[PDB]
Coordinates of C-alpha atoms in Angstrom, one line a residue:
Chain A
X1 CA -37.0 -28.2 -69.0
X2 CA -37.0 -28.1 -65.2
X3 CA -37.8 -31.0 -63.2
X4 CA -36.4 -29.5 -59.9
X5 CA -38.0 -28.4 -56.8
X6 CA -38.0 -24.4 -56.2
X7 CA -38.4 -22.2 -53.7
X8 CA -40.0 -18.5 -53.7
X9 CA -38.5 -16.1 -51.3
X10 CA -40.6 -13.2 -50.4
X11 CA -39.6 -10.5 -48.5
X12 CA -42.4 -8.3 -47.6
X13 CA -40.3 -5.5 -46.5
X14 CA -39.0 -1.8 -46.7
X15 CA -39.0 -2.3 -50.6
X16 CA -42.4 -4.6 -51.2
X17 CA -43.9 -2.3 -48.6
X18 CA -43.6 0.3 -50.9
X19 CA -44.2 0.1 -54.8
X20 CA -41.3 -0.2 -56.9
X21 CA -43.9 -0.5 -60.1
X22 CA -47.8 -1.2 -60.2
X23 CA -49.2 -1.6 -58.0
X24 CA -46.9 -2.5 -55.1
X25 CA -43.4 -3.8 -55.3
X26 CA -44.7 -6.7 -52.6
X27 CA -47.6 -6.7 -55.6
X28 CA -45.4 -6.3 -58.5
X29 CA -43.6 -9.5 -56.9
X30 CA -47.0 -11.5 -56.9
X31 CA -48.2 -11.7 -60.4
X32 CA -44.8 -11.8 -61.5
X33 CA -44.4 -14.9 -59.2
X34 CA -47.6 -16.8 -61.1
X35 CA -45.9 -15.4 -64.1
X36 CA -42.7 -17.0 -63.4
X37 CA -44.4 -20.3 -61.6
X38 CA -46.6 -20.6 -64.7
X39 CA -43.6 -20.9 -66.9
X40 CA -42.2 -23.1 -63.8
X41 CA -44.9 -25.5 -64.0
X42 CA -44.8 -25.2 -68.1
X43 CA -41.0 -25.6 -67.6
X44 CA -42.5 -29.1 -66.6
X45 CA -45.6 -30.1 -65.0
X46 CA -44.6 -31.4 -61.4
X47 CA -42.2 -28.5 -61.1
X48 CA -42.3 -27.6 -57.3
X49 CA -41.8 -24.4 -55.7
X50 CA -41.6 -23.1 -52.0
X51 CA -43.3 -19.9 -50.7
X52 CA -41.7 -18.7 -47.5
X53 CA -41.6 -15.7 -45.6
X54 CA -38.3 -13.7 -45.6
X55 CA -40.5 -10.8 -44.8
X56 CA -41.5 -9.5 -41.4
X57 CA -40.0 -10.4 -38.0
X58 CA -40.8 -14.1 -38.5
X59 CA -39.6 -16.2 -41.1
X60 CA -41.8 -18.9 -42.1
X61 CA -43.0 -21.1 -44.9
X62 CA -46.0 -19.4 -47.0
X63 CA -46.9 -21.9 -49.5
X64 CA -45.0 -25.5 -49.1
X65 CA -44.5 -27.8 -51.9
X66 CA -47.0 -28.1 -54.4
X67 CA -47.4 -28.1 -58.2
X68 CA -50.0 -25.8 -59.5
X69 CA -52.1 -22.9 -58.1
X70 CA -52.3 -23.9 -54.3
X71 CA -49.4 -21.5 -54.1
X72 CA -51.5 -19.0 -56.1
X73 CA -53.9 -19.7 -53.6
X74 CA -51.4 -19.5 -50.7
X75 CA -49.6 -16.4 -51.5
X76 CA -53.3 -14.4 -52.2
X77 CA -53.1 -13.5 -48.5
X78 CA -50.8 -10.6 -47.6
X79 CA -47.9 -10.6 -45.5
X80 CA -45.9 -8.2 -43.1
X81 CA -45.4 -5.7 -45.5
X82 CA -42.9 -3.5 -43.7
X83 CA -41.1 -6.4 -42.6
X84 CA -37.5 -7.4 -42.5
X85 CA -34.4 -10.2 -43.6
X86 CA -35.2 -13.6 -42.4
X87 CA -33.2 -14.1 -45.8
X88 CA -30.3 -16.1 -44.3
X89 CA -32.3 -17.9 -42.3
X90 CA -35.5 -17.6 -44.7
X91 CA -33.0 -19.2 -47.4
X92 CA -31.1 -21.6 -44.7
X93 CA -35.1 -22.6 -44.2
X94 CA -35.8 -22.5 -48.0
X95 CA -32.4 -25.1 -48.2
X96 CA -34.0 -27.4 -45.6
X97 CA -37.3 -26.8 -47.3
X98 CA -35.7 -28.4 -50.6
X99 CA -34.1 -31.1 -48.3
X100 CA -38.1 -32.2 -48.2
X101 CA -38.7 -31.4 -51.8
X102 CA -40.9 -34.0 -52.8
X103 CA -40.1 -36.7 -55.4
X104 CA -36.6 -36.0 -55.9
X105 CA -34.7 -35.9 -58.8
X106 CA -36.4 -32.9 -58.4
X107 CA -33.2 -30.8 -58.5
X108 CA -32.9 -27.8 -55.8
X109 CA -33.8 -24.4 -56.8
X110 CA -35.0 -21.2 -54.9
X111 CA -36.1 -17.6 -56.3
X112 CA -36.0 -14.6 -53.8
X113 CA -37.2 -11.2 -53.9
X114 CA -35.1 -8.8 -52.2
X115 CA -37.0 -6.4 -50.3
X116 CA -35.1 -5.7 -47.8
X117 CA -32.0 -3.9 -47.3
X118 CA -30.1 -7.3 -47.0
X119 CA -28.1 -7.5 -43.3
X120 CA -26.1 -10.7 -43.4
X121 CA -22.3 -11.5 -43.2
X122 CA -20.6 -12.3 -46.5
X123 CA -19.1 -15.9 -44.8
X124 CA -22.7 -16.7 -43.6
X125 CA -24.0 -15.8 -47.0
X126 CA -21.2 -18.0 -48.8
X127 CA -21.7 -20.5 -46.3
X128 CA -25.6 -20.5 -47.4
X129 CA -23.9 -20.2 -51.0
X130 CA -21.8 -23.5 -50.0
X131 CA -24.4 -25.3 -48.4
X132 CA -26.4 -25.0 -51.5
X133 CA -23.9 -25.7 -53.9
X134 CA -23.2 -28.5 -51.3
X135 CA -26.9 -29.4 -51.3
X136 CA -26.7 -28.6 -54.9
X137 CA -29.5 -25.8 -55.3
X138 CA -30.4 -23.8 -58.0
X139 CA -30.6 -20.1 -57.0
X140 CA -32.1 -17.2 -58.9
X141 CA -32.5 -14.1 -57.1
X142 CA -35.2 -11.2 -57.7
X143 CA -33.5 -7.9 -56.1
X144 CA -34.5 -4.3 -56.8
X145 CA -32.7 -2.8 -53.5
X146 CA -31.7 0.9 -52.6
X147 CA -29.0 1.6 -55.1
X148 CA -29.7 -2.0 -55.5
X149 CA -28.9 -4.7 -53.2
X150 CA -25.5 -5.1 -55.0
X151 CA -21.9 -4.8 -55.2
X152 CA -22.9 -6.8 -51.7
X153 CA -23.7 -10.6 -50.7
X154 CA -26.0 -10.8 -53.5
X155 CA -23.3 -10.4 -56.1
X156 CA -20.6 -12.6 -54.3
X157 CA -23.5 -14.8 -53.5
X158 CA -24.4 -16.0 -56.8
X159 CA -21.1 -16.5 -57.8
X160 CA -20.2 -18.1 -54.6
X161 CA -23.0 -20.9 -54.9
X162 CA -21.5 -21.2 -58.5
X163 CA -19.5 -23.7 -60.0
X164 CA -22.3 -24.6 -62.6
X165 CA -24.9 -21.8 -63.4
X166 CA -28.4 -23.3 -63.1
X167 CA -27.3 -26.1 -61.1
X168 CA -26.2 -23.6 -58.5
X169 CA -26.8 -19.7 -59.2
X170 CA -28.0 -17.5 -61.7
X171 CA -28.7 -13.7 -60.7
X172 CA -30.8 -11.0 -61.7
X173 CA -30.6 -7.6 -59.6
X174 CA -33.8 -5.8 -60.8
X175 CA -33.9 -2.6 -62.1
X176 CA -36.2 0.5 -61.3
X177 CA -38.5 2.4 -63.8
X178 CA -41.2 1.0 -65.7
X179 CA -39.5 -2.1 -65.6
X180 CA -42.3 -5.1 -64.8
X181 CA -40.7 -7.3 -62.9
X182 CA -42.1 -10.6 -65.0
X183 CA -41.2 -8.5 -68.4
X184 CA -37.5 -7.9 -66.7
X185 CA -37.0 -11.5 -65.7
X186 CA -38.3 -13.0 -69.1
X187 CA -35.1 -12.0 -69.9
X188 CA -32.9 -13.3 -67.1
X189 CA -32.1 -16.7 -66.7
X190 CA -34.1 -16.8 -63.9
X191 CA -37.0 -17.9 -66.1
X192 CA -37.0 -19.2 -69.8
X193 CA -34.1 -19.7 -71.6
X194 CA -32.0 -22.3 -70.1
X195 CA -34.2 -23.5 -67.0
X196 CA -32.8 -26.0 -65.1
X197 CA -29.6 -27.7 -64.1
Chain B
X1 CA -32.5 20.5 -43.0
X2 CA -30.7 17.6 -44.6
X3 CA -33.7 15.4 -43.4
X4 CA -36.4 17.1 -44.4
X5 CA -34.8 19.3 -47.6
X6 CA -32.8 16.5 -48.5
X7 CA -34.7 13.8 -46.9
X8 CA -37.8 15.6 -48.2
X9 CA -36.8 15.5 -51.8
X10 CA -34.7 12.2 -52.0
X11 CA -36.5 10.8 -48.9
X12 CA -40.0 10.3 -50.1
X13 CA -40.2 12.3 -52.0
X14 CA -39.5 9.2 -54.2
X15 CA -40.8 6.2 -52.1
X16 CA -43.0 7.3 -53.8
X17 CA -42.4 9.4 -56.9
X18 CA -44.2 12.1 -58.7
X19 CA -46.2 13.0 -55.7
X20 CA -47.5 15.9 -53.7
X21 CA -44.5 15.7 -51.7
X22 CA -42.3 17.5 -54.3
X23 CA -44.8 18.9 -56.1
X24 CA -44.8 22.7 -57.2
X25 CA -46.4 24.0 -54.0
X26 CA -45.3 21.4 -52.2
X27 CA -41.5 21.4 -51.9
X28 CA -42.0 25.3 -51.5
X29 CA -43.8 25.3 -48.0
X30 CA -41.0 23.2 -46.5
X31 CA -38.7 25.3 -47.7
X32 CA -40.9 28.2 -46.9
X33 CA -40.9 26.9 -43.5
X34 CA -37.5 25.9 -43.2
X35 CA -34.7 23.9 -44.2
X36 CA -33.4 25.0 -40.9
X37 CA -33.5 21.6 -39.3
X38 CA -36.8 21.8 -37.7
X39 CA -39.7 20.5 -39.9
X40 CA -42.9 18.8 -40.9
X41 CA -42.3 15.0 -40.5
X42 CA -41.1 14.3 -43.8
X43 CA -42.6 11.1 -45.6
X44 CA -41.7 7.7 -44.8
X45 CA -38.0 6.3 -43.2
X46 CA -37.0 10.4 -42.5
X47 CA -40.6 11.2 -41.0
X48 CA -40.4 7.3 -39.6
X49 CA -37.6 9.4 -38.2
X50 CA -39.3 12.8 -38.0
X51 CA -41.7 13.9 -35.4
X52 CA -40.1 17.1 -36.7
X53 CA -41.7 19.3 -34.0
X54 CA -42.4 22.3 -36.3
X55 CA -46.4 21.6 -36.9
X56 CA -46.5 19.6 -40.2
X57 CA -48.6 21.2 -42.5
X58 CA -47.4 19.0 -44.7
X59 CA -50.5 17.6 -42.9
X60 CA -51.5 17.9 -46.3
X61 CA -48.5 16.6 -47.6
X62 CA -48.4 13.5 -45.5
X63 CA -51.8 13.3 -46.7
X64 CA -50.8 12.5 -50.1
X65 CA -50.1 9.0 -51.3
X66 CA -52.6 8.3 -48.6
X67 CA -55.0 8.2 -51.3
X68 CA -52.7 5.7 -52.7
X69 CA -51.9 4.4 -48.9
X70 CA -53.0 1.3 -50.8
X71 CA -49.9 1.0 -53.1
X72 CA -47.7 3.2 -51.5
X73 CA -46.3 3.5 -48.1
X74 CA -48.1 1.3 -46.2
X75 CA -48.7 0.3 -42.5
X76 CA -50.1 1.7 -39.5
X77 CA -48.0 4.6 -40.9
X78 CA -50.0 7.7 -40.1
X79 CA -50.5 7.4 -36.3
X80 CA -47.1 6.6 -36.1
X81 CA -47.0 10.6 -36.4
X82 CA -49.4 13.4 -36.7
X83 CA -52.4 11.3 -34.9
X84 CA -49.4 10.7 -32.7
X85 CA -47.1 13.9 -33.5
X86 CA -49.8 16.3 -34.6
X87 CA -51.6 14.6 -31.8
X88 CA -49.0 16.7 -29.6
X89 CA -49.8 19.9 -31.7
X90 CA -51.9 20.4 -28.3
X91 CA -54.8 22.4 -29.1
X92 CA -58.6 21.6 -28.5
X93 CA -60.3 21.9 -32.0
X94 CA -57.1 20.8 -33.5
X95 CA -57.0 16.9 -32.7
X96 CA -61.1 17.0 -33.0
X97 CA -61.0 18.3 -36.3
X98 CA -58.9 15.6 -37.9
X99 CA -60.1 13.1 -35.4
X100 CA -63.1 12.4 -37.7
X101 CA -61.1 12.8 -40.8
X102 CA -58.6 10.3 -39.8
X103 CA -61.0 7.6 -37.8
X104 CA -63.5 8.2 -40.8
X105 CA -61.1 7.9 -43.7
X106 CA -58.6 5.4 -42.5
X107 CA -61.6 3.3 -41.2
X108 CA -64.1 4.0 -44.0
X109 CA -62.5 5.4 -47.0
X110 CA -59.4 3.3 -46.7
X111 CA -61.4 0.5 -44.9
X112 CA -64.8 0.6 -46.9
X124 CA -55.0 -1.5 -38.1
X125 CA -57.9 1.0 -37.4
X126 CA -58.5 -0.3 -34.2
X127 CA -55.0 1.3 -33.1
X128 CA -56.4 4.4 -34.5
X129 CA -59.7 3.6 -33.3
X130 CA -58.0 3.9 -30.1
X131 CA -55.7 6.8 -31.4
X132 CA -58.9 8.6 -32.6
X133 CA -60.7 7.9 -29.1
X134 CA -57.7 7.8 -26.9
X135 CA -56.8 11.2 -28.1
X136 CA -59.9 12.9 -27.4
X137 CA -59.3 11.8 -24.1
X138 CA -56.4 13.9 -23.8
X139 CA -58.4 16.7 -24.0
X140 CA -60.5 15.1 -21.4
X141 CA -63.3 17.1 -22.4
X142 CA -65.3 15.4 -19.6
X143 CA -64.2 12.0 -17.9
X144 CA -67.8 11.0 -18.6
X145 CA -67.6 10.5 -22.4
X146 CA -64.0 9.9 -21.8
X147 CA -64.4 7.1 -19.8
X148 CA -67.7 6.1 -21.7
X149 CA -65.7 5.4 -24.6
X150 CA -62.7 4.8 -23.0
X151 CA -64.2 1.8 -21.3
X152 CA -65.4 0.9 -25.0
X153 CA -62.0 2.0 -26.1
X154 CA -61.5 -0.7 -23.2
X155 CA -64.5 -3.0 -24.2
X156 CA -62.9 -3.2 -27.7
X157 CA -59.2 -3.8 -26.6
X158 CA -61.0 -6.7 -24.2
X159 CA -61.2 -9.7 -26.4
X160 CA -58.4 -8.4 -28.6
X161 CA -55.3 -10.2 -29.2
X162 CA -53.3 -7.5 -30.6
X163 CA -49.8 -7.6 -31.4
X164 CA -48.9 -4.0 -30.6
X165 CA -48.5 -3.1 -27.0
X166 CA -49.0 0.0 -28.8
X167 CA -52.6 -0.6 -28.5
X168 CA -52.7 -0.6 -24.8
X169 CA -49.4 1.3 -25.1
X170 CA -52.2 3.8 -26.3
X171 CA -54.8 2.6 -24.1
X172 CA -53.0 2.3 -21.0
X173 CA -51.8 5.6 -21.4
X174 CA -55.2 6.6 -22.4
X175 CA -57.1 4.8 -19.4
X176 CA -54.1 6.1 -17.3
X177 CA -54.7 9.9 -19.0
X178 CA -58.3 9.1 -17.6
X179 CA -57.0 8.2 -14.2
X180 CA -54.5 10.9 -14.7
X181 CA -56.7 13.6 -15.0
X182 CA -58.6 12.1 -11.6
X183 CA -57.3 10.2 -8.4
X184 CA -57.3 6.4 -8.1
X185 CA -53.6 6.0 -8.4
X186 CA -54.1 3.2 -6.8
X187 CA -55.9 2.2 -10.0
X188 CA -53.7 4.9 -12.0
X189 CA -50.4 4.6 -10.8
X190 CA -50.9 0.7 -10.8
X191 CA -52.6 1.2 -14.5
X192 CA -49.6 3.3 -15.0
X193 CA -47.3 0.8 -13.8
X194 CA -49.2 -1.1 -16.2
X195 CA -48.6 1.1 -18.9
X196 CA -44.9 1.1 -18.3
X197 CA -44.5 -2.8 -18.4
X198 CA -46.5 -2.1 -21.4
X199 CA -44.1 0.4 -22.7
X200 CA -41.5 -1.8 -21.2
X201 CA -40.7 -3.7 -24.8
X202 CA -40.9 -1.1 -27.0
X203 CA -41.7 2.8 -27.7
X204 CA -38.6 4.8 -27.5
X205 CA -39.8 8.1 -25.7
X206 CA -38.2 11.1 -24.4
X207 CA -37.0 11.7 -20.7
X208 CA -39.5 14.8 -20.2
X209 CA -41.9 12.0 -21.2
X210 CA -39.9 9.2 -19.5
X211 CA -39.5 10.9 -15.8
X212 CA -42.5 13.4 -15.7
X213 CA -44.6 10.1 -16.3
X214 CA -42.6 8.4 -14.2
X215 CA -42.8 11.0 -11.8
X216 CA -46.3 11.4 -12.0
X217 CA -46.2 7.9 -11.7
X218 CA -43.8 8.0 -8.8
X219 CA -46.0 10.8 -7.6
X220 CA -49.3 8.6 -8.2
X221 CA -47.2 6.5 -5.9
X222 CA -48.2 8.7 -3.4
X223 CA -51.6 9.5 -4.5
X224 CA -51.5 6.0 -4.5
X225 CA -50.4 5.0 -1.1
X226 CA -51.4 1.8 -1.6
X227 CA -51.8 -1.5 -0.6
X228 CA -48.0 -0.6 0.3
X229 CA -45.5 -0.2 -1.4
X230 CA -42.8 -0.7 0.2
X231 CA -40.6 -1.5 -2.7
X232 CA -41.4 -1.3 -6.4
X233 CA -40.7 -0.4 -9.8
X234 CA -38.1 1.5 -8.4
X235 CA -36.2 -1.4 -9.1
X236 CA -37.0 -0.7 -13.0
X237 CA -35.4 2.0 -14.7
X238 CA -37.7 4.8 -13.4
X239 CA -35.2 5.8 -11.3
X240 CA -32.3 7.9 -12.4
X241 CA -34.4 8.8 -14.6
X242 CA -36.9 10.0 -11.7
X243 CA -34.1 10.6 -8.8
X244 CA -32.2 12.9 -9.3
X245 CA -33.5 15.7 -7.8
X246 CA -36.6 18.2 -7.1
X247 CA -39.6 16.2 -6.0
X248 CA -37.7 13.1 -7.0
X249 CA -35.4 13.5 -3.9
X250 CA -38.9 13.8 -2.2
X251 CA -40.0 10.9 -4.5
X252 CA -36.6 9.1 -3.6
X253 CA -36.9 10.3 0.1
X254 CA -40.1 8.8 0.1
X255 CA -39.0 5.4 -0.6
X256 CA -36.7 6.3 2.4
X257 CA -40.0 7.2 4.3
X258 CA -41.4 4.3 2.7
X259 CA -38.5 2.3 4.8
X260 CA -37.5 5.1 7.4
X261 CA -40.9 6.4 8.3
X262 CA -40.3 9.4 10.1
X263 CA -42.5 12.3 9.7
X264 CA -40.1 15.1 9.9
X265 CA -37.5 13.2 7.9
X266 CA -40.1 14.3 5.6
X267 CA -42.9 16.7 7.3
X268 CA -40.0 18.7 7.2
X269 CA -39.8 18.4 3.5
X270 CA -43.2 18.8 2.8
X271 CA -44.0 21.8 0.2
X272 CA -47.5 22.3 -1.0
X273 CA -47.7 19.7 -3.6
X274 CA -47.2 16.7 -1.2
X275 CA -49.0 18.8 1.6
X276 CA -51.4 19.2 -1.0
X277 CA -52.9 16.0 -0.3
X278 CA -52.0 15.6 3.5
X279 CA -53.6 12.5 4.0
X280 CA -50.0 10.6 3.4
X281 CA -49.6 12.2 7.0
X282 CA -52.1 9.7 7.5
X283 CA -50.8 7.3 5.0
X284 CA -47.0 7.6 6.5
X285 CA -48.6 6.2 9.9
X286 CA -50.3 3.8 7.6
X287 CA -47.1 3.5 6.3
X288 CA -44.9 3.2 9.6
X289 CA -47.5 0.5 11.0
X290 CA -47.2 -1.2 7.8
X291 CA -43.4 -0.4 7.2
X292 CA -42.8 -1.6 10.9
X293 CA -45.1 -4.7 10.5
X294 CA -44.1 -6.0 7.3
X295 CA -40.2 -6.8 8.8
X296 CA -41.9 -7.2 12.1
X297 CA -43.9 -9.7 10.0
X298 CA -41.5 -11.2 7.9
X299 CA -39.0 -12.3 10.6
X300 CA -39.5 -11.2 14.1
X301 CA -41.4 -14.3 14.7
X302 CA -39.9 -16.7 12.2
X303 CA -40.7 -19.6 14.2
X304 CA -44.2 -20.1 12.5
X305 CA -44.4 -16.0 12.8
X306 CA -47.7 -14.6 13.9
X307 CA -48.6 -13.2 17.0
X308 CA -47.5 -9.8 17.4
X309 CA -49.7 -8.9 20.2
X310 CA -50.4 -5.8 20.7
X311 CA -49.4 -3.0 22.3
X312 CA -45.7 -2.9 23.3
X313 CA -44.9 -4.8 20.1
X314 CA -47.6 -2.3 18.5
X315 CA -45.7 0.6 20.3
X316 CA -42.8 -0.9 18.8
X317 CA -44.0 0.5 15.7
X318 CA -43.1 3.6 17.7
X319 CA -46.7 5.0 16.9
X320 CA -48.2 5.0 20.0
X321 CA -50.6 2.4 21.9
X322 CA -53.8 4.3 21.6
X323 CA -53.2 4.7 18.0
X324 CA -52.5 0.8 18.0
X325 CA -56.2 1.1 19.5
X326 CA -56.9 2.4 16.0
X327 CA -54.4 1.5 13.6
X328 CA -53.1 -1.8 15.0
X329 CA -56.8 -2.3 15.5
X330 CA -57.7 -1.6 12.1
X331 CA -56.6 -4.4 9.8
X332 CA -58.7 -4.8 6.5
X333 CA -59.7 -1.4 8.2
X334 CA -56.2 -1.1 7.3
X335 CA -57.2 -2.6 4.0
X336 CA -54.7 -5.3 4.8
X337 CA -54.3 -7.1 8.1
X338 CA -56.1 -10.4 9.4
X339 CA -56.4 -11.9 12.8
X340 CA -58.3 -10.2 15.6
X341 CA -57.7 -8.7 18.8
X342 CA -57.4 -9.8 22.5
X343 CA -58.5 -6.5 24.2
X344 CA -57.6 -7.9 27.6
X345 CA -54.7 -9.7 27.1
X346 CA -53.8 -7.0 24.5
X347 CA -53.1 -9.6 21.9
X348 CA -53.3 -8.8 18.5
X349 CA -54.5 -11.8 16.4
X350 CA -53.0 -12.4 13.5
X351 CA -53.0 -14.0 10.1
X352 CA -51.4 -13.7 6.4
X353 CA -52.5 -10.8 4.2
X354 CA -48.5 -9.9 4.3
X355 CA -46.5 -10.7 1.4
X356 CA -42.5 -10.3 1.6
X357 CA -38.9 -10.9 0.2
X358 CA -35.1 -11.1 0.5
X359 CA -32.9 -14.3 -0.4
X360 CA -30.0 -16.3 0.8
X361 CA -31.6 -17.7 4.3
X362 CA -34.2 -20.4 4.3
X363 CA -32.9 -21.8 1.1
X364 CA -30.7 -24.0 2.5
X365 CA -33.2 -24.8 5.3
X366 CA -35.9 -25.7 2.5
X367 CA -34.6 -29.0 1.3
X368 CA -33.2 -30.0 4.6
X369 CA -36.2 -30.8 6.6
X370 CA -38.2 -32.0 3.1
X371 CA -35.0 -34.1 2.6
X372 CA -35.1 -34.8 6.2
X373 CA -38.5 -36.7 6.5
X374 CA -37.7 -37.7 2.8
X375 CA -34.4 -39.4 3.6
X376 CA -35.5 -40.9 7.0
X377 CA -39.3 -42.0 5.5
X378 CA -37.3 -44.5 2.9
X379 CA -36.9 -46.1 6.2
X380 CA -40.5 -46.9 6.4
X381 CA -40.5 -46.3 2.8
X382 CA -38.6 -49.6 2.6
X383 CA -40.9 -52.4 1.6
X384 CA -44.2 -51.6 2.2
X385 CA -46.4 -51.6 -1.0
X386 CA -43.3 -53.3 -2.4
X387 CA -43.6 -55.9 0.2

């Protein structure tokens, strides 16, 4: 399936600080990641992902490019739990991240938790979306927001990135309730179905 | 009110779900307390707003999901309030009651982050003063703890300095304290939104502890920083401002006029203003009057030029680091101060140009000599 590089964008933030379904959102993030990434490395071996901090007051990579457990290793340690949006920056990093993605012919992909109220500007958002589509990044987002984060950038964005779907962007905006993220997104073409372009 | 009632229920309440907040007994007691806009500190983002100053008896109901504080609202999250806000409940046994429950819970139960509580519990004790002894003792431990720490919060010292100040606040040593609090302001300087009655009254006590400092003067200070208007204004701040005036003017009865009890409560400023007037006269007498490689100032008329008299000169001027400060010595006969530095100072615009001039003067001229020597 997938030969492309991915990035995992985690906000550990006003949502992740706060359990959206067990045990925390931020924790609900976690095993969903490996779940995803498993299927990602099951998509193909060599399928690579990044992991950054969209959380806190500091954007940064948490797990760099790899292809196995070293992420699951890397993700093992915490984050600022109540932290705040670096998303644009984080994404813009995740972009540059994918600009260094290893042994290319790997297309660019990004997977983004939304644990933050999502403060950004539409143009910047779409400049990202442009830059992505320019860079030709696959972009799928994990969002359970207040309301959710939607009718917003995230909605324009997946569109704005997207001439072709998974060569640019697909969306899922995570729902509340006994909605297991990995169970939820098992549906969405964030994972499975058609996996790359 | 909306924040508590509407926020308590919708707030979190559900952050958060089927918890003790919106539980039978739970929602009642606030409603039982009020919807009336004074409240119990409302569980996350609005308690994150709410210090709300009706005493929380959601004391208990904040304390829910605190077992879930693992998987639930999680941060410091607690002495954010309570241990902050009900620290401000202002009883004696109260704090002590929850001091061992919170320090033993968020440090054991949840642990078996707390450092900032470790200071809160320890620091909070010290509000109660109880006895500078036990205060300082574990305070210095609280300090000793703090020492090695690289702590992202200033809040730790913003606890501690306030705390350690609080310690000195009970005390004199505003030389320390005022400074210590002066430290604390520089610690609060980035962060920690506060109240004016917190703002000035501290900065008052600060501005006061300038007096019960007084000092290695000082003279000029954090008055620059937004303690002013803010502090002065009026009341003793008038004084505190007029004292800044006396920190320049140094006329006794421009102030010994003003003196009421509190300032006359320590009369030693009457010495300190002499200490001032001298030093106040001195500093500029020092900073400028000689510019021309400033030293001499020696003594008497120059010392009476402080318009404090010659036989006190025979002390005040005579004393130097017996003023805590001055260097140099005395020619008794010729009536000459020997002086040296231990005088800091300020201003701008002036020697600025002079600076590079000579220092480019040799410089340029050097190049003449500086022509061939090691080259050739």
